[model samples]
Target: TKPLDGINVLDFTHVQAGPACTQMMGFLGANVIKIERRGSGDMTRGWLQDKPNVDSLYFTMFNCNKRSIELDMKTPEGKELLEQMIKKADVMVENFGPGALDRMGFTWEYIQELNPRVILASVKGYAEGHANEHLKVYENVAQCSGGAAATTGFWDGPPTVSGAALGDSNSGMHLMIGILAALEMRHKTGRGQKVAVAMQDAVLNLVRIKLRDQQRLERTGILAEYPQAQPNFAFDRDGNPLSFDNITSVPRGGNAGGGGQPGWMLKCKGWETDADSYVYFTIAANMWPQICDMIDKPEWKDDPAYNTFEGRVDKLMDIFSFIETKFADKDKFEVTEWAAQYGIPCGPVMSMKELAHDPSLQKVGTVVEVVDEIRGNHLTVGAPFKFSGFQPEITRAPLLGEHTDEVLKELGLDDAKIKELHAKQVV
Candidate 1:
């Protein structure tokens, strides 16, 4: 009883961005018909394959619950077959290079004529900009162009790109919003619309805080909201210097907490050996005395130089310098729980290995095991959210063009025609 049980999607996506969107729809029970080329299929099937005769884990992970059919768009018969499918499908998704589909004769106007109710969605490097819209964009490029790199990393190092997939997968999610909205709108209007998401725009959306600070610096000329906050110096056309807008626009400052608070990642007992043996915490003004007590420094709680929030903020460099030492004798896990019990917010920095094998994370469905016929049992991330009555019935990915015969049969092609089509590499 998934939400999208009756919808049919023509998935012509490859690599990361576009597939991520179709994957979610498949999980919600859309019948995703993935069309690939005759011999190679999706390019990801051959990427990082791990062995000579198998599909790569990267392709296997994202292509679950999809049915693949092989077709070469360059051939006349193949193009005719695709047009037939477009007439029947409720949605169509593609992440091809700029103007690729138009060159294939399936532009938006043509698609609307074929299936007026079909949802046409696309993912691209940039939206509609004349200068750089057609440029090839990957993950880091999106982060760099969208203001993330300018506000990320350390003060001393060069601008850094975040490890997360802000560019590809998140851009897919944004397309999901547009597609889903179009789907809903169709119910009333009986008409479908085109939905487009750009990688750079999506990354720009995720880096909205940088934009917020950039605007704030216009009037204030300085921001003291961050711990050891630096003045922005890059001047705008109005002569409003940018570093006064600067925080990470200075280009980096490690992992400073987002809001107004003095915090740091404190190294704990095993840190001298284990790189991740550290806990991060930020004490509010009310909890300052409790932190002092936990560190056995009650006298400093009332010291005029460190008593109030402003006072402590003024000397944040001095306070955090000694705070790391205070936690050196305690393990990160112990320090995390101890501070949490007293109303201080903290968490131990868990690495991927730790999260993968973690009993608590598994018990709560953050991770779940799925069985594959070829690979046997393996672990994968579960649904991003949970509800009492709804859960996905996870399934394995289909082999290349595995459902071609059945899908062609459904398209009214008989056995002899199907055989001929296969012989011609047009299935």
Candidate 2:
């Protein structure tokens, strides 16, 4: 059996954050019952639809392995049905606006009264008691608020957003940890707990490297590895040289490394034609000799200015520029393979098209092909975590309210009452 096999989840999430968390739990064999509005269901169902009237990839990708039920929670009958479900639930997950669940008469106190052992998990824009806790947050907004966007792009460019869902999915993943921790804690106390993850807080957790750099910049006048620290190399859009002398906050480092080691994104062959024809090459201090050998710069292997990060601080960018010229006649993969021979830390930027059809990813189950008879076959991401004893059995997402009757039956509702509830538009 899978890890969460005996768990029952009441999923009240709609968009990316909460849905992503519950969907992952569903993948791990939890019985996830997703409750939605009677008519519209999740807004993602119609978001960015590729077909005339079918659910979008956005919905299918994040809602897999969960059953859907339509319920008008505003109705007394619906609230009663929810109470019954809560009594049988181990966890209740939600991403509604502030006080929405309380407004619907299912506050944390009411939930605990219904089932003392039921965990309540929530995702919000900001942490409770923060100055901006009530502000609405989206993917990029959280990145901007949490310092990722501020330290992302080139120093000359405006603050840029990342393609990764650092706010939404990241918060969802954080909430999952909170949920799991609460689940473990329940065994000791025989009681559930309230767990909430704020999108901005989650983003901040991931952008902590930048926070470290901020402290470093405050302690020392310069970030030695940054491009702006290189003499006459980095400049502002208006042609003025950039340095730590005027930098109070952590300035963007372009493609420079964010971690302990220094690295750069360098162009390869066909870069002018193919946008992804590039590789990220790192100048790891211990691998400096290997990098020199890979680039056929043996003389620099022992050179004072090129042997150590501290010695090369002023010309690090120039060294990277010279090394990039070596790959002008090779593709990104060729450069990557060539670097491998010298034991250098280098990798090509794999394009989405390449990754979608990659044999290795598919064989490892990181990428999967789901057979949806209604929507035809489509590609999706499978469970990222793999256990030696268990494999996730992924299933298709449900149609809007597709399992309403089935769920109602499981809740021990009689056919006559179910019919009346549907007739009254309260199902």
Candidate 3:
């Protein structure tokens, strides 16, 4: 009952980027037939360790609900078998190195000739052009070039890369969008087209807002929106400009008394080991007086310098210091209850360990556990999108050449021919 129940995909992808796309398609219920090499299969099959044999968790995590067929494209028989599959598949996806497909004799023109209705999708390090021809790229490289490196992390520290694999996963998302768009266009044009996405391009697209900000900086000498505009800062040992030690006008400062007031991470009852012990507390301008009253600091609420946004902005550091003292006295759980009762926006930050056992996520089908015959049961992330009628089933990743015989049979190959190809290491 999946949305893509009738679609068939020839998944010739590997590693993070390409497999991420195919995995999503599989989640949408596409009949994805994964093509891998015979001996080792996908490179990720042995990437990380925990299990003794079979595919690694890294591979199993991204590849599920698909049939695997081993093929040796180096041999003529293997090439022929793949060509046959391509002719029948609705979509072909790959993330091979530049010109690898063309070198393998599966050029776009050739694939179109084999099946004009088939959609060909590809993900590359960069777009095909003279400038990007020889530039090799990986995950962090894309993030660095995409302006994320500039805006990320503390102002004093080196730019940081995100923990998530945005370079690969973002490109996969773009490829999926392109594939869906192409499918929609095919309905009107009656012809399939090629869909291409570059990891660098995808990352750049995600950071376009930062690029816009760069342009905006051209017109203004000072960024008025930033909290650093507040007067009265200190200096570092090296004579470099530094904000006041207890400043509230800096980024992450919740006590500026402007749009909203300051918030802090308060300790909870079980702050040592239990995951639910931490909570965030926020004080808004409208609720500033209430917070002061609750904390027995009502005198500060009527203080002239703390009464208005502009007045508080000037004394943000002192104000935040006073609020921090009150927050230090309460546990996270108590603060959460108190904040909730007063209609304040606050909550605790939960880690993956907490999320894994979260009842709400389980109820919403956000996390799923699938059983693999060889690897036992393992957790697999469920699809982020939810469709009313189409719910994807979580299935085990296929073993190497697990569907070779069945796929050859669908290709109208006799048992003898399949055995011969197997003997020749082409299937």
Candidate 4:
């Protein structure tokens, strides 16, 4: 009784972006038929493998709950098989390079001719008509292109790319939204439309708060919330002080909160040894009194110089430094719990090692250990969304061409025909 129970997806995706989208749809109970190349299958199968001759976590993590069927679409029989699958599919997803589908003799026009009701969803490096639409873009390239790198790291350092999969998985999530919207629209018009998400566009959408700061800096000629706004605080490698005097675009503010609430990443007890032993403590304007109470600085709660954001702008870094001293003897968990008592918004920086084995995350099914007997049991992320009555049952990813005959039978091909197709290497 999942949301996408009867929906069928023709997945012509290989790597991260497109596979992430279809895998999520598969989590929602879609019947996903993943089309792979005849022999090699997905490129990620051999990429970063943990054990010899085993499918890599890179592939397994992103391709769960989908069935695979290998076919050489360059062949005429393979093309005919694809045409039949397209006719029966509700959605077709691909991340092929520009014009690859057209080269394969299946343009959007040709696909429409085959099945008017089938939605075509695509993930591309750029939108179709953009100048750099044909340029190949990977994760970090997209982050730089979308202004994230320019506005991320320290003011003195080179442009920094975030560790998060901002371009790949983020674009996939954006494409999923477009696909869902197209599905809803199909119900109204009785026709499916093209849905596309560019990696740059998705990255830009996520980095929108920086865009807001850009407009503000243009209008005000300064961003009061930035560390540069604090006197004698930020400096370059040359020991010269940094400021917002001649800046046009948004410069990176290291560990500074980008939103209305000003914050900083401060160290806890063992930060010298444990890199992630820290917490992000915010100086929320409305919670200033609570912060003061927690820090035992009750006198500053009523002071004009410390009560408001405008008054505190010039010394925000100083205030954050002072507050950080309080956590010097406390661990991240102790600091977080202590802050919670005062009703302040503070959270520990949960390391990946910690998150992977967190009891609560496993209990809630956010982290799942799949019973993969062949590969040995492995842990993977579960669906982030939770419906009251429907929980996703995540299955292990398919082996290369594992469901070839099963899917061909569902497509109404008999045993002799299946064998012939296999013999021709067109299955």
What are the lDDT scores of the predictions, listed in order?
0.80, 0.92, 0.75, 0.93
Candidate 1 stretches greater than 4 Å from native:
226-250, 299-308
Residue 37 local lDDT, model 3: 87
Residue ranges of candidate 3 with Cα displaced over 4 Å: 225-239, 242-326, 329-338
Each prediction's TM-score versus the true structure: 0.91, 0.99, 0.84, 0.99
**Candidate 4 regions off by >4 Å?**
none
Q: lDDT of candidate 1?
A: 0.80
lDDT tens per residue, model 3, 149-189: 65665544567787677688888989999999999998998
- Model 2 clashing residue pairs (backbone): none
Query: In candidate 2, what are the lDDT values of residues 352-416, reduced to their tens digit?
Result: 99999999989988898887998877888888898998988889999999999999999898999
Candidate 4 C-alpha error for residue 98, in Å: 0.9
lDDT of candidate 1 at residue 128, scale 0 to 100: 72
Better of 1 and 2 by TM-score: 2
Q: For model 3, give the 10-residue run with minimal summed lDDT.
A: 249-258
Can you write out model 1's per-residue Cα lDDT over 1-427, one digit (the tens) per residue?
6888889999999988888888878877889999998888888898987877788878877777788998889999988998899988999999997899999978899999999999999999888764898898988898888888888876555788887899988998899889899999999999999989989899989887777777765656555645335334223457553343344333344666655676777788988799899998786887888888776788888898677876665556557668777778889888888887777877898978898899987887767766789755567666676767667766777788889898988888889889998788776
Task: Note each model's CA RMSD in angstroms.
Answer: 4.2, 0.9, 4.4, 0.8
Q: Which candidate leads the pack in lDDT?
A: 4
